[PDB]
Structures are given as C-alpha cells and as structure tokens.
C-alpha cells in the first residue's frame, strides 16, 4: 500500500515491465502480487476483480521475452487450483509449464 | 443600419404580418409542425406607392441580420442568349 503503482516508484525512472525477470519496477508487479495475496489467503472473489485489470494490461501491452507470461500464468495456476473446474486448470498449467 | 422598427412606425398593424411569415418560422419552425400547417414561402406586398413597402426590406436587414439578396425586376433582364432564365 505504501508503494502501489506509479506513486513512489515513478519519478525519473523508465518502465522495465514490472518484476518478471532481473531488474524491474514496481508498477505492474505489485498489482500482480496483490492479486496472488488475496488468492492464497482470502477467497477468490476479490482475487479475480484485480486479476482482470492485469489480464487486460498484458493483452494490451506486452514485451518480447516470456518472463511476463510465466509470471502471469503463475497467478492463474493458483486461481483454477482451488476451483472445481479441471478443464480450464488443465489448459492453464500447459502454458505455465511451457 | 439606417432605418429601424421605430422609423417604420404607424404600420404596426401590418408589421406583425411579416413577423409571422419571417420571424416566426425562422426562430421557431417547430410551431408549424405541431399544428401541421406548411410554412408560407412567398409573400406579396402591394398597395399605393410611398407607403413604406420598400422600407420593410431595409428594416429586416438591420435587425435579423441574416444574409439577404436584393433582386430588382430590371436587374435580371439582361439578355444575351437565354440569360434572364439563367440568372434566376
């Protein structure tokens, strides 16, 4: 909460596309960590509400390496695990393993 | 601006005749659509000379401000080949 996105982290610093690999900023990574914070602790109601903003951000803006995709698939891997649908969880784990 | 609604005074009974066929349809054309009557297009001005029939044309140009065109009878009669029909 003390950082969030584009408050304390963004002044003179460029955009490295969050924390997926090596160096990075805290803009899109904290939004992803909060999505997995309530997912592994609280219920799945508040987890998907902030997950859609992360999914629409990845589809709108991405980068060349797959470092961001694997970090995004790790969020959905834990989301479908607690559910009763194993068909969507099966396809989700395939993208995370690749 | 030279002649205004004050200089055309005395015609007040006949001044409201033009306001209904000019000022009324241009300001609020939807009134004729509610009743269903068609907006009048042409308006005829006749009578004895010197009663201010020409002043009615100058009084509207200095008030409404819309673009007007003076079309005298003898200005369009220039003839070469079918010229008067083209000028109209």
């Amino acid at each position: 909460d003390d950082l969030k996105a584009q408050f304390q982290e963004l002044d003179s610093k460029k955009q490295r596309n969050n924390g997926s690999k090596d160096h990075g900023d805290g803009i899109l990574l904290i939004d992803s960590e909060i999505a997995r914070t309530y997912l592994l602790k609280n219920d799945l109601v508040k987890a998907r509400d902030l997950l859609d903003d992360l999914e629409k951000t990845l589809d709108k803006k991405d980068s060349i390496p797959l470092r961001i995709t694997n970090s995004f698939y790790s969020t959905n891997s834990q989301y479908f695990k607690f559910k009763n649908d194993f068909n969507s969880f099966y396809y989700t784990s395939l993208l995370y393993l690749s | 601006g030279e002649i205004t609604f004050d200089g055309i005074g005395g015609l007040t009974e006949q001044i409201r005749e033009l306001r209904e066929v000019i000022e009324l349809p241009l300001k609020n054309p939807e009134i004729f659509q509610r009743v269903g009557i068609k907006p009048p297009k042409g308006v005829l001005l006749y009578g004895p000379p010197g009663t201010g029939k020409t002043l009615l044309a100058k009084a509207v140009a200095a008030t409404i401000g819309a673009n007007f065109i003076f079309s005298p009878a003898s200005g369009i009669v220039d003839k070469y080949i079918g010229e008067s029909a083209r000028i109209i």
Partner: protein, 293 residues
C-alpha cells in the same frame, strides 16, 4: 376513488397534444403516465404506440435519475401480455451497460440469472453466446453458472437430467422475484416444455440421420401422437426439415441434396486440399533452418 377509465379519458386526448419535445424531464413523465393507465384499462396496444415515440427520442438523450424509474417496468410489461420472450431479453440487456446508478453491485447480479433463463423460453437467439464471456456471469451467484451450464448443454442435450430438474429444482422457473415477479405455475411452464423438446429436435436434425418412432418416445417422453405434434409444428415454421416415415416407424432427418449441391462441396474440398498443400509447401522451407543447423 377506484376510477380507471375516467382518469385515462382526460389524458387520452393530451398524449398527442403534450409537447414538441422541448421540455426534458417533464416530457418523460406525461408520456409514461398514459402507459400506466392503459395497462390498468386492459389494453396494451395503446401503450405500445407511446413506447415507440418515447424510445426514439431518448435514444441519443442520456437518462437521468428521474427517467429510468419507469423504464424497468412499462418496457417489460407490454411484452408480458404479448408472451414474446425475444423482446424480453432485449430491454433487460439494454439497461446493463448504461450509467447503472440504480444498478447495484450486489442485488442486480442475481437479476442476470433470469436473463439467461429467459433465452431458454425464446427460440434461441443471437444473445446467448454473448452472456457466456461475461465476467459477472462466472462469479458471485452460483445460479449464474447453473443457467450458463445449460447453455453448453444445447447441442449435447440427452434429456436425461432435464425432466429431473423440471420436477425438482425450479428456483427461477415457477418463482420469479427480481424480473417478472411471478404469475402462475402454468404460465411459465407452458412454453418451458415446448422449448426443451425443441432443444433435442434441433440437435437431431443437425446430427441424427434417422431415428425410430419408438426411440423418440424414450427421449422426449411423449406418446405416438404427442411426438409428431411438436415435430410437425417446427416443419411449418421453416426450422426443422424432417420426413416422417410411418411404415418404417422412423423419421428421416437428413435433408435431400441435389446433384449440384453434392458437386458444390466437392469443389470446396479440392480448393481446401490446395490450401493444405500450400501450407505444407511453406513449412518445409521454414523448418529447414532447424534441419540444416
């Protein structure tokens, strides 16, 4: 005082005489007032004419708080007497994406469960696949997924669990709360069984070539006379094309294909093979980089 016609007669001559669409919030009140008196009078055709005039005027005009009050009732009340469910889902979906100040983030979500159920009573539609990808439909109320799970069962319908649900669980079926409000058990179930039978008959025409009459009675759970009743009705409506063979006690669901139609798809197959050959042709050079490495 309990006077209906006396209040409607004085306002009947006014509805055309009201305004030239000058006032904004006032015009909404008078036009929607006669619609309330016409419904209580027992004639919904009088309010139908007023509904077409007010809808085109407010199409480009945004709706304020004092407007949408009456758009949640008078619009869906006319379709109730008409018993037409294709128009029911149209007005309920139109109020979704609007400003939605009166639409709650809690109470309004179970309303969508009725909207999905209303598509079942209607002859399918183009709005069924649009509600599948909705985010609010996959969360919160579990009945949202229950009615959505039935959407994926349209093509796969075996009618095994359909008479089970119709005899056991009827949360949105015979009891309505946030949409219709409920009328009677026979009103909602009249067109309910007609559509469920139509769900299987559409699949058979697109899948099964022919089925015996004894097998149709096991699925649809009808008699010999009741089986051909719903089948013959869909033929006259230009939906299902099937030839019932009485001596063989079967029904031919395969549509007849002429000589030109069989050769038509053959031309597409030849052009399709050339597309696969074209694809394979460019994959040899592309994958050659890994071979020559």
């Amino acid at each position: 005082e309990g006077k209906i016609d006396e209040a409607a007669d004085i306002l009947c001559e006014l509805q055309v005489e009201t305004y030239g669409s000058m006032e904004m919030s006032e015009k909404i009140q008078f036009i929607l007032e006669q619609m309330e008196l016409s419904i209580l009078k027992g004639d919904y055709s009088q309010a139908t004419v007023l509904s077409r005039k007010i809808l085109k005027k407010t199409f480009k005009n945004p709706k304020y708080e004092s407007l949408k009050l009456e758009y949640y009732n008078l619009l869906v009340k006319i379709s109730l007497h008409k018993r037409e469910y294709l128009e029911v889902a149209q007005y309920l979906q139109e109020i979704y994406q609007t400003d939605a100040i009166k639409s709650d983030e809690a109470k309004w979500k179970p309303v969508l469960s009725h909207i999905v159920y209303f598509l079942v009573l209607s002859p399918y539609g183009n709005l069924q696949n649009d509600l599948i990808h909705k985010i609010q439909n996959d969360n919160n109320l579990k009945k949202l997924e229950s009615q959505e799970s039935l959407v994926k069962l349209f093509t796969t319908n075996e009618l095994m669990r359909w008479p089970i649900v119709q005899k056991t669980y009827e949360p949105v079926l015979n009891e309505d709360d946030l949409a219709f409000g409920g009328e009677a058990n026979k009103h909602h179930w009249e067109d309910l069984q007609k559509r469920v039978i139509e769900h299987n008959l559409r699949v058979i025409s697109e899948y099964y070539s022919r089925i015996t009459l004894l097998r149709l009675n096991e699925l649809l759970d009808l008699t010999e006379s009741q089986t051909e009743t719903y089948i013959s009705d869909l033929v006259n409506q230009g939906i299902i094309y099937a030839k019932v063979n009485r001596p063989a006690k079967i029904v031919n669901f395969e549509k007849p294909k002429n000589s030109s139609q069989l050769l038509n798809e053959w031309s597409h197959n030849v052009d399709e093979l050339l597309e696969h050959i074209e694809t394979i042709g460019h994959l040899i050079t592309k994958e050659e980089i890994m071979h020559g490495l």
